[PDB]
Design a protein around this nucleic acid. Structure first.
Lengths: 188, 188
DNA sequence: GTGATCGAAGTT
DNA sequence: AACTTCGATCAC
């Protein structure tokens, strides 16, 4: 339906949509990789990402959250560099950079998984929930507090006309459209 | 239908049956893990295994083949110990052991994947093929020729009344039962 | 085809 | 519930 390098929201899929399995999200076109947390291209940008609480030192305030790139020190390559390119700022592989106009940054589809409940209060009760479009305000390398190795950190800030699922308006909208947890066809 | 610790062939499923994906094999009960190559229990034995050519130094003569346990030296624990228990011989975590009566060993369901074509001429053209029951003749630790680290090796020998799929009789049987590559229901 | 990956079942 | 584990997809 849509190309793999599609930026922005997927047509016909409103914020609050929830799928049980990652493969459902892949077939839906929201997040193509079956396993990988980040969908993007190293010489273009990042198209989507998933919060599944993989890092104990990550935070989540809903409108803003931190993200970590994918036994050794991490580097700004592949998906990490892809995510870095979305930031409206010159690329800096040493100390990172901060966007001058964060809203000018490339749009990123953000999906929160229930697995993130161990680090995030905004994680859904079940499955994987599309929470909308976020943008990279800044990024920088740092030593991870959870395993002592260097990791790349990213700041994501929400910029979407669609109301957040945890907000009253988002609740009213999710209820209005009867958005509920969808299992695969004929699931036991 | 059957317990997870079931030894021997799965009822109603003849040798030569082929599925495209591992998940099909999991749901069929032939090999429960979705990813893992070995299905067994560390304090009981091994129930099934998959040949997908993961090790370049493995061999396959059809009736007999070598298998390797799952950056560092391997140990005789978990699935490896499980596979070791199937051998009719005292457990030896130093130099391994050789069965006195290999036919007395515990039965192991063996599934060959097309991925094994790079090392095995017996690997199927497509998907994953159940080739029947094998038994562990012996096992021993050795330095892997493909990455220089210590690995545990296993010798499997076929003992099944059902004819092998590559044999004339197995061909005639597979043809007779119209056994062909099965895709998941409603696959594009 | 080679290299990469915040997924699900099973065992423990 | 934590750990172990020879898939499926898309990026290069």
């Amino acid at each position: 339906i849509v190309p793999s390098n599609h930026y922005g929201p997927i047509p016909g899929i409103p914020v609050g949509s929830t799928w049980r399995f990652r493969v459902q999200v892949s077939e839906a076109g929201v997040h193509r990789p079956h396993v990988g947390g980040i969908h993007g291209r190293s010489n273009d940008g990042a198209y989507s990402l998933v919060l599944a609480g993989g890092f104990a030192d990550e935070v989540d305030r809903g409108d803003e959250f931190t993200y970590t790139g994918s036994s050794a020190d991490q580097t700004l390559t592949n998906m990490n560099r892809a995510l870095a390119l979305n930031c409206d700022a010159p690329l800096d592989d040493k100390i990172g950079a901060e966007s001058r106009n964060w809203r000018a940054g490339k749009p990123v589809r953000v999906i929160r998984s229930f697995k993130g409940r161990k680090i995030s209060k905004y994680a859904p009760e079940e499955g994987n929930r599309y929470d909308g479009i976020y943008k990279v305000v800044k990024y920088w390398p740092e030593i991870s507090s959870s395993h002592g190795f260097l990791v790349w950190r990213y700041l994501l800030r929400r910029d979407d006309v669609e109301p957040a699922p945890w907000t009253s308006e988002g609740i009213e909208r999710s209820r209005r459209l009867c958005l509920r947890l969808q299992y695969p066809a004929g699931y036991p």
